[PDB]
Amino acid sequence: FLGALIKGAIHGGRFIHGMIQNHH
């Protein structure tokens, strides 16, 4: 029930595109 794929949210939510949830 961790939910978080560690590597701290992929890599910190910026590798893809702002986490797609942070984007800009």
Side-chain angles (χ1 to χ4, degrees), residues 3-14:
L5 284 57
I6 211 86
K7 201 83 174 300
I10 268 60
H11 181 60
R14 177 56 157 285

Side-chain angles (χ1 to χ4, degrees), residues 1-23:
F1 296 93
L2 284 61
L5 284 57
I6 211 86
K7 201 83 174 300
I10 268 60
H11 181 60
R14 177 56 157 285
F15 178 80
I16 313 181
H17 278 303
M19 209 190 174
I20 310 282
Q21 276 57 83
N22 220 283
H23 179 224

